[PDB]
Amino acid sequence: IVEGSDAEIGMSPWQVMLFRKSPQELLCGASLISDRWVLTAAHCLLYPPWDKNFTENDLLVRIGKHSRTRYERNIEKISMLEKIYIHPRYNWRENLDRDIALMKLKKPVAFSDYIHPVCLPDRETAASLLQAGYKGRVTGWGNLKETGQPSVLQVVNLPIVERPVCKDSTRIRITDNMFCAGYKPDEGKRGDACEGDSGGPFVMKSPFNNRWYQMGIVSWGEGCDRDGKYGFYTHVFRLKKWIQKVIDQ
Protein backbone atom coordinates (compact mmCIF):
# COMPACT_ATOMS: atom_id res chain seq x y z
CA ILE A 1 0.00 0.00 0.00
CA VAL A 2 1.32 3.42 -0.99
CA GLU A 3 0.59 6.49 1.12
CA GLY A 4 -1.56 4.54 3.63
CA SER A 5 -1.33 3.91 7.39
CA ASP A 6 -0.71 1.02 9.81
CA ALA A 7 -3.90 -1.00 10.33
CA GLU A 8 -5.38 -1.20 13.83
CA ILE A 9 -5.42 -4.62 15.52
CA GLY A 10 -8.46 -6.62 14.28
CA MET A 11 -9.39 -3.85 11.82
CA SER A 12 -9.43 -6.27 8.91
CA PRO A 13 -10.05 -9.79 10.35
CA TRP A 14 -10.77 -11.13 6.85
CA GLN A 15 -7.29 -10.20 5.58
CA VAL A 16 -5.41 -13.32 4.45
CA MET A 17 -1.71 -13.64 3.43
CA LEU A 18 -0.91 -16.14 0.69
CA PHE A 19 2.42 -17.55 1.81
CA ARG A 20 5.05 -19.34 -0.25
CA LYS A 21 6.52 -22.45 1.39
CA SER A 22 9.84 -22.72 -0.60
CA PRO A 23 11.49 -19.44 -0.26
CA GLN A 24 9.19 -18.66 2.68
CA GLU A 25 7.79 -15.39 1.41
CA LEU A 26 4.63 -13.32 0.94
CA LEU A 27 3.00 -14.03 -2.41
CA CYS A 28 -0.21 -11.98 -2.29
CA GLY A 29 -3.15 -10.92 -0.18
CA ALA A 30 -6.51 -12.66 -0.05
CA SER A 31 -9.72 -12.48 2.00
CA LEU A 32 -11.68 -14.92 4.19
CA ILE A 33 -15.32 -15.23 3.10
CA SER A 34 -16.36 -18.26 5.20
CA ASP A 35 -14.70 -20.69 7.62
CA ARG A 36 -13.42 -22.74 4.64
CA TRP A 37 -13.16 -20.33 1.62
CA VAL A 38 -10.58 -17.69 0.75
CA LEU A 39 -10.83 -15.22 -2.16
CA THR A 40 -7.81 -13.98 -4.15
CA ALA A 41 -6.72 -12.57 -7.57
CA ALA A 42 -6.24 -15.24 -10.27
CA HIS A 43 -2.89 -13.74 -11.31
CA CYS A 44 -1.46 -14.54 -7.83
CA LEU A 45 -1.82 -18.22 -8.65
CA LEU A 46 -1.73 -18.43 -12.45
CA TYR A 47 0.29 -16.21 -14.76
CA PRO A 48 1.72 -18.11 -17.78
CA PRO A 49 3.60 -15.27 -19.44
CA TRP A 50 5.95 -15.46 -16.41
CA ASP A 51 5.66 -19.27 -15.89
CA LYS A 52 3.66 -18.93 -12.64
CA ASN A 53 1.19 -21.76 -12.06
CA PHE A 54 0.80 -22.67 -8.36
CA THR A 55 -0.36 -25.97 -6.94
CA GLU A 56 -2.11 -26.26 -3.56
CA ASN A 57 0.95 -27.87 -1.97
CA ASP A 58 3.16 -24.88 -2.86
CA LEU A 59 1.25 -22.42 -0.66
CA LEU A 60 -0.04 -21.74 2.80
CA VAL A 61 -2.62 -19.18 3.98
CA ARG A 62 -1.99 -17.11 7.07
CA ILE A 63 -5.12 -15.70 8.68
CA GLY A 64 -5.39 -13.33 11.67
CA LYS A 65 -2.14 -11.52 10.85
CA HIS A 66 -0.95 -7.96 11.53
CA SER A 67 2.89 -8.04 11.35
CA ARG A 68 4.25 -8.95 7.87
CA THR A 69 7.33 -10.96 8.81
CA ARG A 70 6.81 -12.27 12.36
CA TYR A 71 5.03 -15.53 13.18
CA GLU A 72 2.21 -14.31 15.36
CA ARG A 73 2.06 -17.04 17.98
CA ASN A 74 -1.43 -17.64 19.56
CA ILE A 75 -3.02 -15.15 17.10
CA GLU A 76 -2.55 -16.14 13.44
CA LYS A 77 -3.64 -19.48 12.10
CA ILE A 78 -1.87 -21.08 9.15
CA SER A 79 -3.94 -23.40 6.91
CA MET A 80 -3.17 -25.73 4.03
CA LEU A 81 -5.25 -25.59 0.83
CA GLU A 82 -7.48 -28.38 -0.35
CA LYS A 83 -8.29 -26.99 -3.77
CA ILE A 84 -7.62 -23.94 -6.00
CA TYR A 85 -10.30 -22.73 -8.44
CA ILE A 86 -9.49 -20.14 -11.12
CA HIS A 87 -12.30 -18.36 -13.01
CA PRO A 88 -12.61 -20.34 -16.31
CA ARG A 89 -12.57 -17.06 -18.23
CA TYR A 90 -9.76 -15.32 -16.41
CA ASN A 91 -7.94 -13.41 -19.21
CA TRP A 92 -4.21 -13.55 -18.51
CA ARG A 93 -3.55 -13.16 -22.25
CA GLU A 94 -4.64 -9.54 -22.42
CA ASN A 95 -5.89 -7.39 -19.53
CA LEU A 96 -6.61 -9.65 -16.49
CA ASP A 97 -10.33 -9.68 -17.13
CA ARG A 98 -12.08 -11.71 -14.36
CA ASP A 99 -8.98 -11.70 -12.13
CA ILE A 100 -10.43 -13.95 -9.41
CA ALA A 101 -9.76 -17.34 -7.77
CA LEU A 102 -11.13 -19.30 -4.81
CA MET A 103 -9.13 -21.49 -2.44
CA LYS A 104 -10.81 -24.22 -0.40
CA LEU A 105 -9.07 -24.88 2.93
CA LYS A 106 -8.18 -28.36 4.19
CA LYS A 107 -9.95 -27.72 7.55
CA PRO A 108 -12.39 -24.96 8.70
CA VAL A 109 -10.49 -22.09 10.30
CA ALA A 110 -11.62 -21.20 13.79
CA PHE A 111 -12.92 -17.65 14.11
CA SER A 112 -11.62 -15.30 16.80
CA ASP A 113 -11.03 -11.60 17.62
CA TYR A 114 -8.51 -11.55 14.73
CA ILE A 115 -10.22 -13.94 12.30
CA HIS A 116 -13.75 -13.32 10.89
CA PRO A 117 -15.20 -13.43 7.31
CA VAL A 118 -16.22 -10.44 5.18
CA CYS A 119 -19.64 -10.22 3.43
CA LEU A 120 -20.12 -10.53 -0.31
CA PRO A 121 -22.43 -7.96 -1.84
CA ASP A 122 -25.95 -8.63 -3.03
CA ARG A 123 -27.18 -6.83 -6.18
CA GLU A 124 -28.78 -4.07 -4.13
CA THR A 125 -25.78 -3.37 -1.89
CA ALA A 126 -23.57 -3.32 -4.98
CA ALA A 127 -25.95 -0.94 -6.79
CA SER A 128 -26.12 1.41 -3.80
CA LEU A 129 -22.44 1.41 -2.81
CA LEU A 130 -20.45 1.01 -6.03
CA GLN A 131 -20.73 4.65 -7.10
CA ALA A 132 -18.10 7.21 -8.17
CA GLY A 133 -17.21 9.43 -5.24
CA TYR A 134 -18.07 6.76 -2.62
CA LYS A 135 -14.98 5.48 -0.76
CA GLY A 136 -13.81 1.99 0.09
CA ARG A 137 -10.76 0.63 1.88
CA VAL A 138 -7.82 -1.49 0.66
CA THR A 139 -5.36 -3.29 2.88
CA GLY A 140 -2.21 -5.38 2.45
CA TRP A 141 1.48 -5.89 3.21
CA GLY A 142 2.79 -4.93 -0.26
CA ASN A 143 5.11 -2.15 -1.41
CA LEU A 144 5.14 1.20 0.33
CA LYS A 145 6.50 2.78 -2.88
CA GLU A 146 6.56 1.97 -6.59
CA THR A 147 10.34 1.42 -6.88
CA GLY A 148 10.01 -0.42 0.93
CA GLN A 149 8.29 -3.13 2.97
CA PRO A 150 5.90 -2.35 5.89
CA SER A 151 6.41 -4.00 9.29
CA VAL A 152 2.63 -4.27 9.71
CA LEU A 153 -0.59 -4.40 7.64
CA GLN A 154 -1.32 -1.10 5.84
CA VAL A 155 -4.66 0.54 5.10
CA VAL A 156 -5.96 3.25 2.76
CA ASN A 157 -9.43 4.59 1.94
CA LEU A 158 -10.04 5.55 -1.73
CA PRO A 159 -12.90 6.93 -3.83
CA ILE A 160 -14.37 4.88 -6.64
CA VAL A 161 -13.68 6.70 -9.94
CA GLU A 162 -16.08 7.32 -12.92
CA ARG A 163 -15.68 4.81 -15.75
CA PRO A 164 -14.71 7.48 -18.41
CA VAL A 165 -11.90 8.71 -16.16
CA CYS A 166 -10.77 5.09 -15.52
CA LYS A 167 -10.75 4.31 -19.29
CA ASP A 168 -8.99 7.54 -20.18
CA SER A 169 -6.27 6.97 -17.56
CA THR A 170 -4.92 3.83 -19.15
CA ARG A 171 -3.81 2.12 -22.36
CA ILE A 172 -5.37 -1.20 -21.24
CA ARG A 173 -8.83 -2.27 -22.42
CA ILE A 174 -11.06 -2.00 -19.29
CA THR A 175 -14.09 -4.30 -18.90
CA ASP A 176 -17.31 -4.28 -16.81
CA ASN A 177 -15.54 -6.83 -14.47
CA MET A 178 -13.29 -4.03 -13.29
CA PHE A 179 -13.62 -0.74 -11.51
CA CYS A 180 -10.99 1.79 -10.57
CA ALA A 181 -10.37 3.79 -7.38
CA GLY A 182 -8.06 6.57 -6.24
CA TYR A 183 -7.94 10.31 -6.00
CA LYS A 184 -7.91 12.54 -9.10
CA PRO A 185 -4.59 14.44 -9.73
CA ASP A 186 -5.66 17.68 -8.08
CA GLU A 187 -8.00 16.37 -5.34
CA GLY A 188 -5.00 16.69 -3.04
CA LYS A 189 -5.21 13.35 -1.21
CA ARG A 190 -3.09 10.36 -2.37
CA GLY A 191 -2.93 6.55 -1.97
CA ASP A 192 -2.82 3.30 -3.94
CA ALA A 193 -2.34 -0.41 -3.73
CA CYS A 194 0.90 -1.70 -5.24
CA GLU A 195 2.82 -4.98 -5.87
CA GLY A 196 2.35 -7.45 -2.99
CA ASP A 197 -1.19 -6.15 -2.17
CA SER A 198 -2.44 -8.09 -5.10
CA GLY A 199 -5.43 -10.32 -4.32
CA GLY A 200 -6.35 -8.29 -1.23
CA PRO A 201 -9.89 -7.02 -0.62
CA PHE A 202 -11.40 -3.67 -1.50
CA VAL A 203 -14.23 -3.45 1.09
CA MET A 204 -17.00 -0.93 1.91
CA LYS A 205 -19.03 -0.55 5.10
CA SER A 206 -22.77 -0.61 4.64
CA PRO A 207 -24.64 2.33 6.15
CA PHE A 208 -27.73 0.12 6.17
CA ASN A 209 -26.63 -2.81 8.30
CA ASN A 210 -23.10 -1.85 9.61
CA ARG A 211 -21.49 -4.81 7.83
CA TRP A 212 -18.37 -4.75 5.70
CA TYR A 213 -18.76 -5.92 2.15
CA GLN A 214 -16.04 -6.93 -0.20
CA MET A 215 -16.58 -5.18 -3.52
CA GLY A 216 -13.23 -5.44 -5.13
CA ILE A 217 -10.03 -7.38 -5.35
CA VAL A 218 -6.58 -5.76 -5.89
CA SER A 219 -5.77 -6.55 -9.50
CA TRP A 220 -3.46 -4.17 -11.44
CA GLY A 221 -2.40 -0.60 -12.18
CA GLU A 222 0.11 1.46 -14.17
CA GLY A 223 2.75 2.00 -11.46
CA CYS A 224 1.58 2.89 -7.90
CA ASP A 225 0.08 6.23 -6.75
CA ARG A 226 0.99 8.19 -9.94
CA ASP A 227 -1.00 11.34 -10.71
CA GLY A 228 -3.80 10.69 -13.27
CA LYS A 229 -3.45 6.91 -12.82
CA TYR A 230 -5.74 4.68 -10.73
CA GLY A 231 -5.71 1.22 -9.11
CA PHE A 232 -7.83 -1.39 -10.86
CA TYR A 233 -9.93 -3.99 -8.96
CA THR A 234 -11.82 -7.15 -9.86
CA HIS A 235 -15.61 -6.31 -9.60
CA VAL A 236 -16.63 -9.02 -7.17
CA PHE A 237 -20.42 -8.66 -7.51
CA ARG A 238 -20.18 -9.07 -11.33
CA LEU A 239 -18.52 -12.45 -10.76
CA LYS A 240 -20.70 -13.69 -7.88
CA LYS A 241 -22.65 -16.24 -9.93
CA TRP A 242 -19.28 -17.97 -10.47
CA ILE A 243 -18.38 -17.59 -6.79
CA GLN A 244 -21.67 -19.19 -5.66
CA LYS A 245 -21.44 -21.85 -8.37
CA VAL A 246 -18.06 -23.02 -7.04
CA ILE A 247 -19.21 -23.01 -3.41
CA ASP A 248 -22.34 -25.10 -4.17
CA GLN A 249 -19.70 -27.47 -5.66
Binding site: Q24, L60, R68, T69, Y71, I78
Partner: peptide
Protein backbone atom coordinates in the same frame (compact mmCIF):
# COMPACT_ATOMS: atom_id res chain seq x y z
CA UNK B 1 13.52 -12.07 6.60
CA UNK B 2 10.23 -13.78 7.38
CA UNK B 3 10.51 -15.45 10.76
CA UNK B 4 10.49 -19.24 10.43
CA UNK B 5 6.98 -20.63 10.90
CA UNK B 6 6.32 -23.94 12.77
CA UNK B 7 7.33 -27.10 10.83
CA UNK B 8 3.96 -28.78 11.49
CA UNK B 9 2.55 -26.62 8.65
CA UNK B 10 5.10 -28.22 6.23
Amino acid sequence: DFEEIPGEYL
